[PDB]
Design a protein around this ligand. Structure first.
Ligand SMILES: COc1cc2ncc3c(N)nc(-c4cncc(OC[C@H](N)Cc5ccccc5)c4)cc3c2cc1OC
Length: 276
């Protein structure tokens, strides 16, 4: 039953990294399109990433939700590992933010709700993403979200993500929790409304300085209820963020006035609002 590289017609490179390359492929027997993540075994071993790649596959194997990438199959030849992932036709959320400038209230609410629902599922399995950002949140043909890149995920019973979305506790205690993803969520909501992430500076050190000082400003147009939500997620104390266990979880987060009109139970059945 195991698949081979010969079973596929590979196409364009979708993304390139230091440890992997994601290529679009059409399976010959089925005509199905997959995003195949290809990882060179020598380079993984040389840079000591075996625990990272192993955990990545293990985390993706446990994912069974429409708002997350699916691992359909794995195989290997002499040089490379292949992970067969779901293909998200419409690409990164980041593309759409830069294209339309900034989302309106209807679109901000719907896509934020999808991210919250995704995170609720994810954190309910005791998994932290640790690198949540618009480029890691993809969009399928139906324009629903698909969160990918679990190469730096943490399974709860050491890394530092992307600078602009890094939480203060990671800069202070080197520790990561579920609340770290929720901080990232707050940056993402801000970015959807404002067009740019909240903490911006000339270099990483200067960005990290702004994070620990909570040095950011809202534009005047910023949706009042969206602002209130962001202010309750961008909190230096990870214990005081909406959604976290110490704040009694996802109930209160989902009950926030910004989500008033949201039907939480069937988001992926709903038709997404058009991005204008
Ligand atoms: C139409 O366009 C696209 C469609 C797509 N469909 C499915 C995907 C999938 N299941 N996983 C990834 C994915 C999986 N590990 C990591 C990752 O990124 C991490 C970094 N940012 C940069 C990077 C990108 C690729 C490989 C290594 C590093 C992305 C990407 C895609 C994907 C990407 C597309 O365009 C960017």
């Amino acid at each position: 039953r195991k698949k081979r590289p010969e079973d596929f017609k590979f196409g364009k490179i979708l993304g390139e990294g230091s440890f992997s390359t994601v290529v679009l492929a059409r399976e010959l027997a089925t005509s199905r399109e997959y995003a195949i993540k290809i990882l060179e075994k020598r380079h993984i071993i040389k840079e000591n990433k075996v625990p990272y790649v192993t955990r990545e596959r293990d985390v993706m194997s446990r994912l069974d939700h429409p708002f997350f990438v699916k691992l359909y199959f794995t195989f290997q030849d002499d040089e490379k590992l292949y992970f067969g992932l779901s293909y998200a036709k419409n690409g990164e959320l980041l593309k759409y933010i830069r294209k339309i400038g900034s989302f309106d209230e209807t679109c901000t609410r719907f896509y934020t709700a999808e991210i919250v629902s995704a995170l609720e599922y994810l954190h309910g399995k005791g998994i932290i993403h640790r690198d949540l950002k618009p480029e890691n949140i993809l969009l399928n043909e139906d324009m629903h979200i698909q969160i990918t890149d679990f190469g730096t995920a943490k399974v709860l019973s050491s890394f530092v993500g992307t600078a602009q979305y890094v939480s203060p506790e990671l800069l202070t205690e080197k520790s990561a929790c579920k609340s770290s993803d929720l901080w990232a969520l707050g940056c993402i909501i801000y970015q959807l409304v404002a067009g740019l992430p909240p903490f911006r500076a000339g270099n990483e050190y200067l960005i990290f300085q702004k994070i620990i000082k909570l040095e950011y400003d809202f534009p005047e147009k910023f949706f009042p209820k969206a602002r209130d939500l962001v202010e309750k997620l961008l909190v230096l104390d990870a214990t005081k963020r909406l959604g976290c266990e110490e704040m009694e979880g996802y109930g209160p987060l989902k009950a926030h006035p910004f989500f008033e009109s949201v039907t939480w139970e069937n988001l992926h059945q709903q038709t997404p609002p058009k991005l204008t």
